[PDB]
Design a protein around this ligand. Structure first.
Ligand SMILES: Nc1ncnc2c1ncn2[C@@H]1O[C@H](COP(=O)(O)OP(=O)(O)NP(=O)(O)O)[C@@H](O)[C@H]1O
Lengths: 294, 7
């Protein structure tokens, strides 16, 4: 039943989140963006005047309702310099409100679509993502939605992983996952073929994000999502537009990400040692790429 | 921007 399923779920969440209403300490709720699960606002801490982000998600308007536990749990258990800080989670009416840090630098998509990144900047982003993924993969947690949209920046050029709503977990008992979850263009071929998959799907997705940072778009981006998925399924791994300008350490790096067989694909822990990541620039080198500085 | 797929 709909009621039995909803009410029980709301009550479970109520216990999982913090009690009360964040409006008791927050002013100026203003929408700044929308996603898949819900909308995102900025708010003001009444006492200090400091800005925070608030993600509001309707319980009644989710495809897989149970995935909303991720929105709270992941940022709780996995505090990391490359992971978005979560302060509090609340239940307001039929909505889940997650209070987290505001990333003033915006999404990586904003940069990737407008300007071209040098290898120093690309390596900085890759290192940040992989450091975050290695901690997650070590605990069997798969992100499942790695893309430039899921990557956020500070004003000083630091890089953080976001959007943990699609996370699944694997363990000794649950070796692989089977669910079709993620964004079509970034999806791994084994996941599209509906085969049992592990954390290796994030590694492939990262490779697609590398193609983003170099070329501006994922492969088959002009194609319809459903049609483009079958293309990733049947074809050989996608290549960069022109390799004449890219360094061999970047080629070598991407060759470890975009492997069709997940068993031959490199793990996050392995890639953290790859020579390409040593070119990673300081946070300062990322700053010129941002909106205010274009 | 493309939207994610579930199920
Ligand atoms: N902490 C934050 N600071 C600034 N902007 C944010 C923050 N979190 C999200 N955004 C942006 O606000 C918009 C909301 O979309 P998003 O948060 O991706 O929803 P979503 O797709 O349901 N995420 P998920 O289901 O967890 O993978 C996006 O364009 C984000 O780039």
């Amino acid at each position: 039943p709909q009621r039995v399923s909803h009410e029980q779920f709301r009550a479970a969440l109520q216990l999982v989140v913090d009690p009360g209403d964040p409006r008791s300490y927050l002013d100026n709720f203003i929408k700044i963006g929308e996603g898949s699960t819900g909308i995102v606002c900025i708010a003001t801490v009444r006492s200090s005047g400091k800005l925070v982000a608030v993600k509001k998600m309707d319980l009644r308007k989710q495809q897989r309702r149970e995935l909303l536990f991720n929105e709270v749990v992941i940022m709780r258990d996995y505090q990391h310099e490359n992971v978005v800080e979560m302060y509090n989670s609340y239940l307001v009416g039929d909505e889940l409100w997650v209070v987290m840090e505001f990333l003033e630098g915006g999404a990586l998509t904003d940069i990737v679509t407008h300007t071209r990144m040098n290898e120093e900047q690309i390596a900085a982003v890759c290192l940040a993502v992989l450091q975050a993924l290695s901690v997650l993969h070590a605990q069997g947690v798969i992100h499942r939605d790695i893309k430039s949209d899921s990557i956020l920046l500070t004003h000083d050029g630091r890089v953080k992983l976001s959007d943990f709503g699609f996370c699944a977990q694997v363990s000794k008992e649950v070796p692989r996952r089977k669910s079709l979850v993620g964004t079509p263009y970034w999806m791994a071929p084994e996941l599209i073929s509906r085969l049992p998959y592990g954390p290796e799907v994030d590694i492939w997705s990262l490779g697609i994000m590398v193609i983003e940072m170099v070329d501006g778009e994922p492969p088959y981006f002009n194609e319809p999502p459903l049609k483009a998925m079958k293309m990733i399924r049947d074809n050989l791994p996608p290549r960069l537009k022109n390799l004449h300008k890219v360094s061999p350490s970047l080629k070598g790096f991407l060759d470890r990400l975009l492997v069709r067989d997940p068993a031959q694909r490199a793990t996050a822990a392995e890639l953290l040692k790859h020579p390409f990541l040593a070119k990673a620039g300081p946070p300062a080198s990322i700053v010129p790429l941002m909106r205010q500085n274009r | 921007r493309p939207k994610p797929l579930v199920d």
